[PDB]
Amino acid sequence: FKCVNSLKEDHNQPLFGVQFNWHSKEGDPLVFATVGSNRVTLYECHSQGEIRLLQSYVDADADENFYTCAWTYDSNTSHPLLAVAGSRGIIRIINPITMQCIKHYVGHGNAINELKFHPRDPNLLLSVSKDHALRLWNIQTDTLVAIFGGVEGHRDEVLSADYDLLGEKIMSCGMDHSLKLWRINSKRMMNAIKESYDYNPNKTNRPFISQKIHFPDFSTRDIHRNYVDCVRWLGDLILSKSCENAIVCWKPGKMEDDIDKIKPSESNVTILGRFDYSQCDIWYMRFSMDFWQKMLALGNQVGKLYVWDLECTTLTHHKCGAAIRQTSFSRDSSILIAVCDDASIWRWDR
Numbered sequence: 256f257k258c259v260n261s262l263k264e265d266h267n268q269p270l271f272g273v274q275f276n277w278h279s280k281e282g283d284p285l286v287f288a289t290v291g292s293n294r295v296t297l298y299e300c301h302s303q304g305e306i307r308l309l310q311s312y313v314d315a316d317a318d319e320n321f322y323t324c325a326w327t328y329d330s331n332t333s334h335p336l337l338a339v340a341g342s343r344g345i346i347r348i349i350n351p352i353t354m355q356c357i358k359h360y361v362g363h364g365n366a367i368n369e370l371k372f373h374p375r376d377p378n379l380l381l382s383v384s385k386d387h388a389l390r391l392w393n394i395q396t397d398t399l400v401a402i403f404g405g406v407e408g409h410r411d412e413v414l415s416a417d418y419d420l421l422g423e424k425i426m427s428c429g430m431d432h433s434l435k436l437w438r439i440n441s442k443r444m445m446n447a448i449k450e451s452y453d454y455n456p457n458k459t460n461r462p463f464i465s466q467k468i469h470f471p472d473f474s475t476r477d478i479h480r481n482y483v484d485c486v487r488w489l490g491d492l493i494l495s496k497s498c499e500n501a502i503v504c505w506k507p508g509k510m511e512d513d514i515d516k517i518k519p520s521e522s523n524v525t526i527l528g529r530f531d532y533s534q535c536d537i538w539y540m541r542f543s544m545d546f547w548q549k550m551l552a553l554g555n556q557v558g559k560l561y562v563w564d565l566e567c568t569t570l571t572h573h574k575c576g577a578a579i580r581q582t583s584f585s586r587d588s589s590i591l592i593a594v595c596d597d598a599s600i601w602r603w604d605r
């Protein structure tokens with residue numbers, strides 16, 4: 256990788272999120288979104304390192320702080336859609352062509368730390384909050400499918416979550432140092448999702464009833480000794496990090512235990528490896544994988560970018576000195592974008 260371009264957003268506030276749109280066809284524009292302050296900005300990647308500013312969404316509330324964004328598509332037209340959330344705990348659905356807000360979802364009792372769309376169902380949106388819960392939404396029928404939390408749920412702010420390859424299960428993590436498994440391929444959850452597609456408030460005077468999931472399918476506090484701020488699936492394995500200068504690769508149960516045989520009472524975990532690095536010991540720093548799950552990237556608090564081939568390289572620039580909060584690979588893995596605390600954007604081309 257070589258640094259081909261850099262720019263700074265006029266708001267001069269930290270950028271906490273970056274996502275390339277992985278739903279665009281070959282020959283169609285290479286687009287990424289950035290989130291910082293009360294803003295969402297779209298950019299296009301052109302040849303010779305050129306970055307073109309497309310459009311910006313400025314929220315009506317000046318005190319809103321966006322922390323996360325995620326792309327999806329309309330199941331009928333295949334047209335792109337962009338979800339955003341942050342400090343106000345309100346999910347906003349944006350039309351990326353006009354950059355106008357289509358609709359919003361109110362419900363979480365505090366800020367939203369992450370948004371993730373289901374890998375097979377573009378209408379299923381997962382949100383994780385400072386209110387100690389996760390929420391699953393159906394954005395086609397505007398319904399709250401389920402709430403994940405309660406007695407055996409997270410005991411502090413939830414920081415991250417990820418669906419597995421097929422979207423049969425979710426792994427969540429947060430300030431309570433725990434990593435929790437939630438199965439969504441159970442008879443209960445499959446019927447709840449089916450019911451959410453049948454609901455229409457105009458054909459009944461009764462509200463839609465959400466599932467209250469009080470108990471996870473697995474839980475551990477034996478991987479990290481501080482806040483767990485990023486979690487991703489790698490097949491049946493889990494990659495997770497704290498502020499302890501390492502990404503840990505692990506699995507529930509003993510070495511030969513199958514993930515779908517794991518019981519909620521499982522007391523063991525198996526450590527399979529660790530990715531070591533330096534000067535990334537502050538809270539709120541995300542790692543990312545490319546679409547192929549062949550590359551892993553993580554930025555540090557002094558502007559250094561670490562890249563590992565999963566089948567270590569350190570990327571530096573004399574003008575890049577601020578903390579890299581999140582990175583994103585283009586679908587073909589030829590471009591890597593990094594966003595920083597000083598509102599700067601960095602483009603690395605393979």
Ligand SMILES: CS(=O)(=O)c1ccc(-c2cnc(NCc3cccc4c3CCO4)n3cnnc23)cc1
Pocket residue numbers: 269271272322323366367368369414415484485538539540541580581596
């Ligand atoms: C410059 S400062 O004032 O020191 C500062 C620093 C961090 C935050 C902050 C960032 N991000 C989130 N949530 C999203 C999140 C969650 C997990 C990992 C992760 C991210 C974004 C990158 O990595 N926050 C929730 N509450 N505060 C924050 C706010 C102010």
